[PDB]
Amino acid sequence: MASKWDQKGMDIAYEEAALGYKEGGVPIGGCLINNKDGSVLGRGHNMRFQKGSATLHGEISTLENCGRLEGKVYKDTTLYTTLSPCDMCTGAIIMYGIPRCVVGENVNFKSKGEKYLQTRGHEVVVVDDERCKKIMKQFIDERPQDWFEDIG
Amino acid sequence: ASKWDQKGMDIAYEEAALGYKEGGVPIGGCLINNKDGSVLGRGHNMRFQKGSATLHGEISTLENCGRLEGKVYKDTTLYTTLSPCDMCTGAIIMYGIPRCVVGENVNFKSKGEKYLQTRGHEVVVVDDERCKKIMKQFIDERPQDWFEDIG
Ligand SMILES: [Mn+2]
Numbered sequence A: 001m002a003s004k005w006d007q008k009g010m011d012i013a014y015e016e017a018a019l020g021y022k023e024g025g026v027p028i029g030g031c032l033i034n035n036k037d038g039s040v041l042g043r044g045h046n047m048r049f050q051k052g053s054a055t056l057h058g059e060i061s062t063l064e065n066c067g068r069l070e071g072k073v074y075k076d077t078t079l080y081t082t083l084s085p086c087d088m089c090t091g092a093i094i095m096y097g098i099p100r101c102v103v104g105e106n107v108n109f110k111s112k113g114e115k116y117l118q119t120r121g122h123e124v125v126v127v128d129d130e131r132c133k134k135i136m137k138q139f140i141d142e143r144p145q146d147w148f149e150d151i152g
Numbered sequence B: 001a002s003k004w005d006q007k008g009m010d011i012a013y014e015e016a017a018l019g020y021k022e023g024g025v026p027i028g029g030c031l032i033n034n035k036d037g038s039v040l041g042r043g044h045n046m047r048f049q050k051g052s053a054t055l056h057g058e059i060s061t062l063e064n065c066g067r068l069e070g071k072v073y074k075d076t077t078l079y080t081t082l083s084p085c086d087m088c089t090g091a092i093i094m095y096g097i098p099r100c101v102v103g104e105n106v107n108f109k110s111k112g113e114k115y116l117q118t119r120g121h122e123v124v125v126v127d128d129e130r131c132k133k134i135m136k137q138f139i140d141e142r143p144q145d146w147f148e149d150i151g
């Protein structure tokens, strides 16, 4: 079953989102898991406020923390993200050839990238995770200026 | 529209050449305000300098710009010595940068170049001989590094 590790992947992604939230950042987390054995290649969260970073989205920080892997490794992984990916994080999934992307929720944010991934041959799974929806809803409500000056 | 294109590509090439001297992939970029030609940021590929999986030349350029107001990006041109991969294409789209000027797409090209135009962005390929030469040399001298990356 392709979804064997999906509860583990989204649980780690949410923990990263909650950790980033406690650090004062945007609560978006992710992790990359080897589909073969469920091992975690890397995990991360949005670093826009922790590091003043314009590019360290949750998915980008996750892939950066994985390090430079062999191209064959990416081809049998799933990228977990608590929030539907923007066009840049979509492009990163495509560029590395990660075949599966499991999305916590796309209620608080959605780009054309979710559909573009499927156009480019990737599998996209939206789990509608209530924990992810709640923590991002709170961020948008409490920090609307930070959100709408960013990808909001 | 193309008033600053020689300035932008010259800075992008200098970043690529600087990255070459540091031992990295010779891909450079810069972001320029279309209004007055001021440089918002510049950078080069940091895959080998920092062991980075994501700091492509275009990504490093945007990182070096810092967190800007969304209105600022909407009137810029991103200059890159090499045609962008799907990730750097997505960064241009996500920030709404309306213009991308590409040094060359002979040594590398992805579906992103056409996708940028599909999404309403202007793409200009200048066929810069300096950029073609320095990337041709890198591919020849470091084929393992190139083909284990986006090659
Ligand atoms: Mn993103």
Ligand SMILES: [Mn+2]
Pocket: B056, B057, B058, B084, B085, B086, B087, B088, B089
């Ligand atoms: Mn790239």
